[PDB]
Amino acid sequence: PQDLEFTRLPNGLVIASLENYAPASRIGLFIKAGSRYEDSNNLGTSHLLRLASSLTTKGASSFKITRGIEAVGGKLSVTSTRESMAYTVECLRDDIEILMEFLLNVTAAPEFRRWEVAALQSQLRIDKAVAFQNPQAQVLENLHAAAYRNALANSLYCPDYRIGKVTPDQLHYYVQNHFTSARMALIGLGVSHPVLKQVAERFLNMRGGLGLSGAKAKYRGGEIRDQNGDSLVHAALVAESAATGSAEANAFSVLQHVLGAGPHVKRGSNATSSLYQAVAKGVHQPFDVSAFNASYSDSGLFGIYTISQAASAGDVIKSAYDQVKTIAQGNLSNTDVQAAKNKLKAGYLMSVESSEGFLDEVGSQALVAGSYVQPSTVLQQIDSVADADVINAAKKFVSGRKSMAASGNLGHTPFVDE
Amino acid sequence: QDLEFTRLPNGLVIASLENYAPASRIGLFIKAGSRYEDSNNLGTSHLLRLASSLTTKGASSFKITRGIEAVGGKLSVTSTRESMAYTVECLRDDIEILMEFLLNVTAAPEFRRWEVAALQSQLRIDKAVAFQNPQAQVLENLHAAAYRNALANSLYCPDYRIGKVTPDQLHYYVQNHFTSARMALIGLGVSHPVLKQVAERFLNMRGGLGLSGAKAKYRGGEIRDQNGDSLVHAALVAESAATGSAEANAFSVLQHVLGAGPHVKRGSNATSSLYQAVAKGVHQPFDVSAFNASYSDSGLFGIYTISQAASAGDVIKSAYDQVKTIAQGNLSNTDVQAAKNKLKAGYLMSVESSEGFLDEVGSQALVAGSYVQPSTVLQQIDSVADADVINAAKKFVSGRKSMAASGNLGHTPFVDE
Amino acid sequence: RSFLCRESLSGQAAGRPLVASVGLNVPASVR
Amino acid sequence: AALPATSESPVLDAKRSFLCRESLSGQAAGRPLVASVGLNVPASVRY
Amino acid sequence: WLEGIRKWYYNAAGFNKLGLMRDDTIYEDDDVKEAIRRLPENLYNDRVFRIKRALDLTMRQQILPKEQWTKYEEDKFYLEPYLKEVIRERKEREEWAK
Structure with a gap:
């Protein structure tokens, strides 16, 4: 096919x-x-x-x-x-x-x-x-x-x-x-x-x-809080991470898939998501939590996105953030990083299956980098990412200044400082 | 009687x-x-x-x-x-x-x-x-x-x-x-x-x-409201003191040192140190006052500015910098006597109308549960030293800041800068 | 209302916390 | 275009509620949002 | 000379005696309505006051002083390009419809 x-x-x-x-x-x-x-x-x-x-x-x-x-x-x-x-x-x-x-x-x-x-x-x-x-x-x-x-x-x-x-x-x-x-x-x-x-x-x-x-x-x-009473509270808490196309950006991608970056199994339990397991240990209310990665040409944002009940918002956020801090403390096995790499590589290859996805990848590559690289190079860049790179990224998020945005009934939502 | x-x-x-x-x-x-x-x-x-x-x-x-x-x-x-x-x-x-x-x-x-x-x-x-x-x-x-x-x-x-x-x-x-x-x-x-x-x-x-x-x-914290209006209104405050203390009086005397509203119709606000500091450099229409809001358990002291979108920061910084010179011990006796006179006259003029006298008596009865005649209020204003004013100003400077700005804020600085 | 000069802009900045008042047959004011 | 789109767009219409953790799963965001419009296609947003 | 006849006819038509331009007198069908809707607001307001003044003049059976009459060489065909574009769009729709 040329x-x-x-x-x-x-x-x-x-x-x-x-x-x-x-x-x-x-x-x-x-x-x-x-x-x-x-x-x-x-x-x-x-x-x-x-x-x-x-x-x-x-x-x-x-x-x-x-x-x-x-x-x-x-x-x-x-x-x-x-x-x-x-x-x-x-x-x-x-x-x-x-x-x-x-x-x-x-x-x-x-x-x-x-x-x-x-x-x-x-x-x-x-x-x-x-x-x-x-x-x-x-x-x-x-x-x-x-x-x-x-x-x-x-x-x-x-x-x-x-x-x-x-x-x-x-x-x-x-x-x-x-x-x-x-x-x-x-x-x-x-x-x-x-x-x-x-x-x-x-x-x-x-x-x-x-x-x-x-x-x-x-x-x-900064911090932007939007009280609007909605049954659920959506909270995003990020730090500055890295610009797209770097070893640090790849470490942040591996860290996103270590923490959990969306569901693989329909109506599952997100068993391999460490953030989800940390939140589900203590929060017995309906919730969602994922790691959030936003890479750009000159900067990036890495953090956590949570959806929770208004009453349990603080518990979910503290649970997720403390799981990230535990990864920053050097608690991260090789099997979890291998699994995260597999998730990341499979997701990248699946994104370019469709003509829309492949076109979007080629276009963004031509804009950001001015060059095209095949998926095999992308995958071996993912492979090169070491454990210490993930641990770091997590350290940089933990030690980094935080920006937060929440929406809903925020009477029980924490602030960036608390 | x-x-x-x-x-x-x-x-x-x-x-x-x-x-x-x-x-x-x-x-x-x-x-x-x-x-x-x-x-x-x-x-x-x-x-x-x-x-x-x-x-x-x-x-x-x-x-x-x-x-x-x-x-x-x-x-x-x-x-x-x-x-x-x-x-x-x-x-x-x-x-x-x-x-x-x-x-x-x-x-x-x-x-x-x-x-x-x-x-x-x-x-x-x-x-x-x-x-x-x-x-x-x-x-x-x-x-x-x-x-x-x-x-x-x-x-x-x-x-x-x-x-x-x-x-x-x-x-x-x-x-x-x-x-x-x-x-x-x-x-x-x-x-x-x-x-x-x-x-x-x-x-x-x-x-x-x-x-x-x-x-x-x-x-x-900081809340910014970009709305593109002609003027930018910004308020920069720190925590000051709850109403019912000598520190609240120090903040009131400092508010009238800085400038707490216009006395003379269409005047240049000559005795306002904040306004003079802004007028030394900003040649655009502007206003700057000192903002004081004391409540039962807290209070906010800072500066309120209205200015052009493009000169916003130049106003705000000027205002801020003026306060810092008061923090560095630059505040005379004549300025504080004038501030005390402004404060005492404003207090006596506020209760002139039956509306204002009723409001003052009601707030006293709630906040304090006792009436205090204006002579004692004036005496409390007189007790405030120069160092109490100086801080009050130092506390605002060193204190953490909250900022709220609205307008076209492309040149409005952030509370951190 | 438009403010176009420093003289009319004078005494427009706030110095005290706002108060809201409503009535029976009077307009609702702020201060 | 030729195809209708996974979701048509009523403004001023409540979309859907989420009552279970199973339904809530996948609704958290992980990537920056993109906005898409189209001549003859429903507008979409993605996160 | 064609322009002699043209200026003669412009004087004889007599909407210049009311301060009107030629495009002020056009019969307003749907094409012309869209053309007037596409005008920049200053031209629209000029058109509206010119027409209101002319209606006020004809209500009294009066005309303007000769100094105030629209000169033939100063008549602005302000509405002509908008009308031509509106008509082009209508013609394109009809060509598609066949």
């Missing part, structure tokens, strides 16, 4: 293509354009930009894009993290030229007409309310606001006061400063490399440079 | 002053502020404040409204974090009627389901009106950020709690905070025996100490 072909053009744009010969083709344009590039004056600009695909472009009207992508059964999706924006077109392999022209019009020639932009402010409210129906969305937003001072402190969602105020000039300035060639990677699964090169030649010649150089994320170490 | 002061075995206080003035004004003061709420009944005090004219055992809602309006009288509820004052004000000849209403409102409410539910919308109205002031939300955030509990509770109902404050919560709240040894009846233009008759005849139902809220516990 081999991944990865090249970097003189404009700095990256193009990577794997022709797997699958009936469907998937093309993603990955850009360093997340909400970490906003400042205090244009918060929510990139959220409206995420919602702004399928608006009129210089080469195709809004009706043309909607109707002409639905005609071929195609899909146009925009997925944002705090650091990246990925624009994906997926369709059958015979219709990829139409979808690629649409994608290139969307990213390189956006028009941001004032009436279409003013008729899109309502979906900021709709989109954010739908996301905030999950109690974790706002807890993670508050955790980033309380862990950072400036850059990663920015929400993926528009501030409520900024809704109805994100202007077309903010969108134009944003695209002109973040959608540049040396910040972009076009990655096609199920396409030929020369085709992607011709696509990258017909467009994507904005500046061939680095655009606006966003600020370094500054650790804050 | 003087202020007659009785303390019943019920623990309820009576304080009466007959000035023979055409209006009579009666206040029932209670230890019932938001500090007595807990995690499960937040906003009950706000609805309770909003519910003074609902049906009671001895008077329907219509009877209360119509009967107070028939005499041209006024019924008002004034709440702080620690106290609730229910005041009726009318002429001398009608005070009995208002007194009767006043005592069916605080000792016999029915909190009928339909009336409480019809009142739930008023919580949203009331809070949205209060929050047209950027200071209201900043002070709510400052108390939340400065305390882990108790004084952390807002004067206003949490938005999630609006429409959820139940009649049973109102009944529980009154039953546990509206007791005799938590109440003081303060009458102006009334006879002390008359006020005593009405007090014992109605306010002897709940007798005792009621429910007890926990000691307010300092956190030293």
Whole structure:
């Protein structure tokens, strides 16, 4: 099924293509354009930009894009993290030229007409309310606001006061400063490399440079508490860990899977999760606990996420934190680290099974590192991680300053200091 | 002639002053502020404040409204974090009627389901009106950020709690905070025996100490409210002292050294050292005052600033730095004499209105359970040394800080910096 | 209300803890 | 797109309750959240 | 000369005597309604006051002084590009519908 072909053009744009010969083709344009590039004056600009695909472009009207992508059964999706924006077109392999022209019009020639932009402010409210129906969305937003001072402190969602105020000039300035060639990677699964090169030649010649150089994320170490009475309390307690793609980051991944990083068995007991066992020793109420890992280009957050009854919130949090401290005290066997490595490696290989997952991995790799590495190298990097590296990471979390975000009835929730 | 002061075995206080003035004004003061709420009944005090004219055992809602309006009288509820004052004000000849209403409102409410539910919308109205002031939300955030509990509770109902404050919560709240040894009846233009008759005849139902809220516990946290408004309002405080001590007086004298409000219309606030320090460097419109909030078990002392988003830090730092020079022993005698004069004149001017005199007597009767004439208050101000002011300032500087800021905060510093 | 000069901005900062007051036929104030 | 999405999006609609530890299991977050929108697909969030 | 006839007709039409521009007099069908909805707010407010003044003028059977009349060479076709874009979108929808 051929081999991944990865090249970097003189404009700095990256193009990577794997022709797997699958009936469907998937093309993603990955850009360093997340909400970490906003400042205090244009918060929510990139959220409206995420919602702004399928608006009129210089080469195709809004009706043309909607109707002409639905005609071929195609899909146009925009997925944002705090650091990246990925624009994906997926369709059958015979219709990829139409979808690629649409994608290139969307990213390189956006028009941001004032009436279409003013008729899109309502979906900021709709989109954010739908996301905030999950109690974790706002807890993670508050955790980033309380862990950072400036850059990663920015929400993926528009501030409520900024809704109805994100202007077309903010969108134009944003695209002109973040959608540049040396910040972009076009990655096609199920396409030929020369085709992607011709696509990258017909467009994507904005500046061939680095655009606006966003600020370094500054650790804050604060606490945000959202009393809202919800039956459950969601609490996140983190410290600064490491930037993505390092030996320390891999140690933090192994530590996440030592502590427990989500369930493997349906309705199970999370037996191999040491955090879960520590909490279930004393907390006989319904609960969930996992280790939380958030790695970024210039920083990272490692800690614990707990969901519990309002009454038992403190007991769950103290139990989890003391289990982490016990790992920091050098109590960590080789079998548990082998099991954690197996979990991590299996999860990594399973994430790239789908075309969406493999495309996302290749795109993030091309943005963060500017190079592609096969899963075998990733797995042996996981293998290289030693026991002392895990013990460390846990020490760094324990000794590190903490940021906390909780939501629910917090009358029994501790503070960062207690 | 003087202020007659009785303390019943019920623990309820009576304080009466007959000035023979055409209006009579009666206040029932209670230890019932938001500090007595807990995690499960937040906003009950706000609805309770909003519910003074609902049906009671001895008077329907219509009877209360119509009967107070028939005499041209006024019924008002004034709440702080620690106290609730229910005041009726009318002429001398009608005070009995208002007194009767006043005592069916605080000792016999029915909190009928339909009336409480019809009142739930008023919580949203009331809070949205209060929050047209950027200071209201900043002070709510400052108390939340400065305390882990108790004084952390807002004067206003949490938005999630609006429409959820139940009649049973109102009944529980009154039953546990509206007791005799938590109440003081303060009458102006009334006879002390008359006020005593009405007090014992109605306010002897709940007798005792009621429910007890926990000691307010300092956190030293930061709450930031980015909202993009033109100006940035920031409050930076430390723990100072509880009202009822000499250190509280030192903090009051230090507040008037720093600057505690404008004396002269449109003036430059020349005698305010904080304002002068900010005006030496910030050429933009600004305001800076010293903030003082002493309560029964604690108090907050610090600085409040309003400024441009871009000059925010330059204001805040300037203000902060000025305080530190007072901490380093830079504070003259003439400045402290001027501060004492400002404080004494402000105290005497605050009780000029019958509203203010009633408020001062009520807070004295609750906090201390004894009246202290203004001459002794002035003497306590005079006793404060220069070193007491100096720290007070040193304690604020070395003390842990809580900060609450609102506006466009891109240049507002963090409490740690 | 708009505040655009230092003279009108004067005496807008807080110095004491806020008080909330409601009434019968009077507006609800803060202080 | 061609496929409907594991979950459609009602705003102003209570989603689901969790009453058991078995249901609560997996709801804790481990990775930073991503936000996804789509021309003709339900919007999603992931943690 | 075509422009002689054009300026003659512009004078004879006489909406310039009311202070109106040409695009103020257009019959408002659905395309024109969307075009007016897409105007920037300053142009919309100018249009609204111009039209209100002209209605006030015709209510009195009066016209403006000749100095205040819209000059033919100063008539701003402010609504023309928005209308052309609205009509292009309608035409595209219809071409799709066939």
